[PDB]
Design a protein around this ligand. Structure first.
Ligand SMILES: CCCCCCCCCCCCC/C=C/[C@@H](O)[C@H](N)CO
Ligand SMILES: *C(=O)CCCCCCCCCCCCC
Lengths: 266, 62, 4, 235, 213, 279
């Protein structure tokens, strides 16, 4: 009658609002909405900071382009937001930090384009390395920030055993970690199938084996976007359309304040 | 301290609730055997983790 | 004892 | 003949088991107890007593009475730290042999808050203000007062109350840390800097010792009993 | 198996390395392969080189760790202690950890100190009889005193008195001088042999004489 | 009462309720039952899922280690008069793969030890029955440097003294994790390189590893002094998780394991060939 649809949503957090008119409902991972540490689950004893609206708001990462030969993209959280406004500052000034997230992936095209993206949110997304040496990807390479990384179609082993790259080599049909991509659907996910929807919204609780941890040392969630069905349009052979990822911290609390961490990335 | 529970009987002799008895002999619960009387749950958190869960007879996209 |  | 069936484990000897065994001297007339002062019920009671920290393990000082003395003076370089120490209470060489460090070295894991108390042993005419700080791990270890004051800290004013306590609050990711050194369970940094300087009048010593003490707070516990590396025996 | 060669002098000043080699047989290769060093040492219970993934400095600020770490090798690791004071011995140990049997190794230790320096000076004028011409064999800077030995060419040697040790900064100093009496020639290869057993062959310093009028 | 739901009888349909159509884009699985798309009869269902509970899926001792230890004259060379094993489930593959259907777990652990021995030399007399000491050395405790040094006094570490030929030894251990659950996967590092670090080695650590020593080691020795003939033994260790809870399911490992992380190397082609239209 007045017209509410699970295809049209507005998300408002802090000073930021997102609208979509072609959603496919939204996922709350494992059925758990984010929340703060309860006193009976608390572990550091100092009073936490809870920046609230200053950090729990939508940050848009740099857009990536989906073309016919794209194999996929991945980001880790909190890493993709390490340089985002006051979320990054609080993350680096405190030994411990905890946060849930709303992830909104945006990709519009037209009624004559086709393709389907799988958007998966993976707890502890360990990725495989590029060489004979095990567990050797370096901190700077494992953590690309908002730039994220990419998937490949095959294992290209780094051979310069002299000046090893120490990078991940995520093969796409193996989900970058030795399992088959088809089973990634056991993880919280949505599909952006261009004939049906133009966005995916997934709410992520904080998941870890601890109530709070070091955000600088450990990524809690990985976001993997892979073309389940490749992009195609009319009869053109080089169609490209943007994919934009907007993520908002939720229920952020931090403990253990001191001087700022300055990681060496370069 | 004997716990008495019912067995779920498979093959029946040509002879009812058959029971078995358990006593824990150690103070540390890690020493205990497994009771294997385990409850289950709903798969929904994995099969339907949607903010608006819709009924299967209705359209998924309205 | 305790039957269950 | 009660029918019995022997399970795995039969006839083993586990040195941490807890079983009954026949008494070799039956009906012995045991001497009854008397009330001796000083009974202890838990090893953590000993970790709660302040014991003096060997803070100065420089070459010529370690293993002498001088390992317990840190020199303060009115001409010290005010920009430099007075002392620096890692929060590894069973492993850092300044903390591992205190009563707190000796008890933790019989356990694999520790958790809780700790308190450092410092005693000024200058004359009554000496004054000064000192900043003592704790930086939870993960950033550069403080090299200046400017960095140290951004973490947990106490500014001590010297005066009639001779001593000052800084509490290092339990701030940890894991629920228990390891007593060996491990970066995964590292505890952070303690540093101390002059806030103003030691000032004395004429005819007064310009240098003096400071002594430091450490003990566990009431939320501290240890678990997983293990042998210590602090005693051995040769063949 | 454990095959550590480290019984090292060890030179002071400093500085030198404190190595640890564990050559690995050979068809049952070793992991996890973390390496621990325990001093000997008021060990309660740390002055430790431990290396899990990233090399961890258990607090003795004056340390250098050089092994192909954060990856693996495994361990024929080298340590270094500078510096530069005689933080001596005592002793040091080198213990490894292993998935097979090898959460174990061997204690292995040695020396440190201290080499001296030498020069020769010869004067003054001969008004006899019948002492000095005079050759002096100065020996500066060596706590374990260097055995200075004056010899020459003839039986005019039995005459060799010593300045004992009035020690400089931690380090002992001496001067042997001769005397050798009287009279004329230049002219002989009178050689002072200063030892200490460090460096190469003992410090052999040959000189002349002050002949006057 | 643990049986699965009964099938309801259902008949024809001609309606606007369309359970057969759905949109998997939402992230949900369509909860259909056969009576949504065909006519069914009533069936009183008696099957149960008793054997696929988390406890029953893990309720088996699985081999995780084979430790070899000898009893012979102490020579000067490298021998195996005692052996050390770093405790792990990643030296074998079968239990590793079942645990890794999940990201986190919490359980007590039962260890059963099977010990076998044999002669190696045709004959230098015989051997009297051997007793084995299996000592647990937690991270930080002193490790033995020889088979009879002082660490074997075991005043605080727990040891099992097992007699050859007795029933396999068995002990239980509580949940001993430092966190509230064991992490089967850790996307992170134990150290972070900082800009002010003196060199790059200082902040370098292995990807996805946590503590260095993890749970410590088991040190095994034969307590007997040597006989003239050499005797070799193997201790096989079987782990069984009990009182098990698990969280966050994962795809199972599909290509061979290559080390303790998730790295892969060969046989990256798990699926065989089959024609699209071949039954
Ligand atoms: C006398 C024999 C005593 C044996 C004592 C063994 C103690 C250790 C039990 C460990 C059970 C390990 C299960 C695995 C946990 C790992 O997944 C994770 N890395 C922990 O975060
Ligand atoms: C509940 O336990 C009531 C009493 C049960 C009586 C039978 C006990 C059998 C022996 C148990 C011994 C445990 C180890 C001392």
């Amino acid at each position: 009658a007045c017209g509410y649809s699970d295809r049209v949503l507005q998300l408002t957090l802090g000073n930021s609002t997102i609208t979509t008119q072609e959603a496919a409902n939204s996922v709350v991972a494992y059925g758990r909405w984010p929340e703060f540490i309860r006193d009976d689950e608390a572990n550091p004893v100092d009073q936490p900071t809870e920046p609230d609206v200053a950090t729990c708001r939508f940050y848009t990462l740099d857009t990536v382009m989906w073309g016919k030969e794209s194999k996929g993209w991945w980001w880790k959280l909190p890493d993709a937001l390490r340089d985002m406004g006051l979320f990054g500052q609080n993350m680096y000034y405190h030994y411990l930090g905890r946060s849930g997230y709303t992830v909104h992936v945006q990709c519009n095209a037209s009624k004559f384009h086709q393709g389907a993206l799988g958007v998966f949110a993976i707890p502890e997304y360990c990725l495989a390395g590029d060489s004979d040496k095990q567990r050797y990807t370096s901190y700077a390479n494992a953590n690309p920030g908002e730039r994220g990384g990419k998937f490949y179609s095959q294992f290209n082993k780094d051979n310069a055993v002299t000046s090893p790259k120490r990078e991940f080599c995520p093969v796409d049909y193996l989900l970058g970690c030795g399992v088959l991509l088809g089973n990634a659907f056991v993880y919280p996910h949505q599909i952006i199938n261009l004939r049906t929807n133009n966005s995916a919204t997934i709410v992520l609780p904080y998941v870890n084996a601890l109530a709070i941890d070091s955000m600088v040392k450990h990524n809690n969630w990985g976001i993997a976007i892979l073309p389940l069905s490749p992009l195609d349009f009319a009869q053109d052979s080089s169609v490209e359309i943007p994919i934009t990822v907007t993520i908002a911290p939720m229920c952020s609390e931090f403990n253990g304040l001191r001087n700022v961490t300055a990681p060496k990335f370069q | 301290g004997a716990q008495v529970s019912s067995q779920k009987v498979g093959a029946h002799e040509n002879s009812s609730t058959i029971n078995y008895t358990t006593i824990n002999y150690y103070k540390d619960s890690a020493s205990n055997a497994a009771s294997k009387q385990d409850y289950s749950q709903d798969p929904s958190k994995f099969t339907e983790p949607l903010k608006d869960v819709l009924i299967k007879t209705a359209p998924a996209l309205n | 004892i305790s039957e269950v | 003949g009660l029918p019995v069936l022997n399970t795995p484990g039969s006839n083993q000897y586990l040195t941490s088991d807890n079983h009954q065994s026949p008494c070799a001297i039956p009906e012995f007339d045991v001497t009854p107890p008397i009330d001796i002062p000083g009974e202890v019920k838990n090893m953590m009671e000993l970790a709660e007593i302040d014991t003096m920290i060997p803070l100065n393990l420089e070459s010529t000082k370690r293993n002498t009475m001088d390992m317990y003395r840190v020199t303060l003076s009115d001409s010290a370089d005010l920009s430099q730290p007075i002392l620096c120490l890692s929060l590894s209470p069973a492993f850092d060489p300044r903390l591992s042999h205190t009563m707190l460090g000796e008890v933790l070295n019989y356990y694999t894991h520790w958790a809780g808050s700790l308190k450092f108390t410092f005693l000024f042993c200058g004359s009554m005419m000496a004054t000064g203000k000192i900043l003592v700080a704790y930086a939870p791990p993960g950033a550069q270890p403080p090299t200046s007062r400017k960095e140290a004051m951004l973490g947990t800290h106490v500014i001590w004013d010297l005066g009639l109350q001779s001593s000052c306590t800084m509490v290092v609050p339990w701030i940890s990711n894991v629920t228990y840390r390891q007593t060996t050194q491990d970066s995964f369970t590292e505890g952070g940094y303690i540093s101390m800097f002059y806030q103003t300087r030691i000032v004395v009048p004429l005819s007064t010593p310009k240098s003096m010792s400071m002594l430091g003490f450490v003990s566990a707070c009431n939320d501290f516990s240890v678990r997983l009993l293990r042998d210590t590396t602090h005693i051995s025996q040769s063949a | 198996v454990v095959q550590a060669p480290t019984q090292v002098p060890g030179f002071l000043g400093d500085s030198v390395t404190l190595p640890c080699y564990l050559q690995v047989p050979n068809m049952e290769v070793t992991h996890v392969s973390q390496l621990t060093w325990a001093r000997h040492g008021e060990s309660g219970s740390m002055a430790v080189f431990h290396q899990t993934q990233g090399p961890s400095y258990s607090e003795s600020k004056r340390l250098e760790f050089v092994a192909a770490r954060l990856g693996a090798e495994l361990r024929d690791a080298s340590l270094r202690m500078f510096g530069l004071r005689v933080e001596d011995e005592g002793s040091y140990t080198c213990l490894f950890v292993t998935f097979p049997q090898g959460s174990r190794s061997v204690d292995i230790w040695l020396r440190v100190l201290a080499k001296p320096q030498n020069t020769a000076e010869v004067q003054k004028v001969q008004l006899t009889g019948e002492p000095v011409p005079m050759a002096r064999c100065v020996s500066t800077g060596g706590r374990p005193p260097a055995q200075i030995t004056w010899h020459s060419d003839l039986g005019g040697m039995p005459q060799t008195s010593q300045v004992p040790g009035f020690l400089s900064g931690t380090v002992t100093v001496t001067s042997l001088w001769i005397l050798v009496p009287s009279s004329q020639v230049d002219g002989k290869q009178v050689t002072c042999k200063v030892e200490h057993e460090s460096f190469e062959k003992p410090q052999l310093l040959t000189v002349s004489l002050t002949v006057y009028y | 009462q643990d049986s699965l739901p009964d099938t309801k009888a259902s008949g024809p349909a001609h309606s606007k309720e369309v359970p057969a159509l759905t949109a998997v884009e939402t992230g949900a699985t369509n909860p259909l039952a056969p009576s949504d798309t065909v006519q069914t009869r009533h069936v009183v269902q008696r099957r149960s899922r008793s054997e696929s509970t988390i406890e029953s899926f893990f309720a088996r001792g699985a081999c995780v280690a084979i430790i070899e230890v000898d009893n012979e004259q102490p020579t000067t060379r490298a021998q195996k008069l005692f052996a050390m094993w770093r405790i792990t489930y990643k030296d074998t593959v079968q239990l590793r793969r079942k645990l890794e259907f999940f990201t986190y777990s919490r359980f007590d652990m039962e260890f059963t030890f099977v010990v076998t021995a044999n002669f190696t030399n045709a004959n230098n007399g015989h051997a009297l029955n051997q007793v084995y000491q299996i000592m647990y050395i937690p991270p930080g405790a002193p490790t033995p440097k020889s088979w009879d040094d002082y660490t074997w006094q075991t005043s605080s570490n727990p040891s099992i003294f097992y007699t050859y030929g007795a029933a396999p030894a068995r002990i239980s251990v509580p949940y001993v994790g430092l966190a509230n659950a064991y992490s089967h996967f850790y996307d992170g590092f134990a150290k972070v390189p900082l800009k002010t670090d003196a060199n790059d080695q200082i902040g370098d650590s292995l990807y996805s590893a946590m503590t260095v020593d993890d749970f410590g080691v088991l040190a095994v020795r034969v307590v007997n002094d040597h006989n003239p003939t050499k005797v070799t033994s193997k201790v096989r260790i079987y782990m069984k998780p009990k009182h098990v809870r698990v969280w966050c399911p994962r795809p199972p490992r599909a290509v061979p394991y290559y080390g303790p992380g998730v790295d892969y190397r060969n046989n990256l082609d798990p699926l065989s060939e089959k024609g699209l239209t071949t039954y």
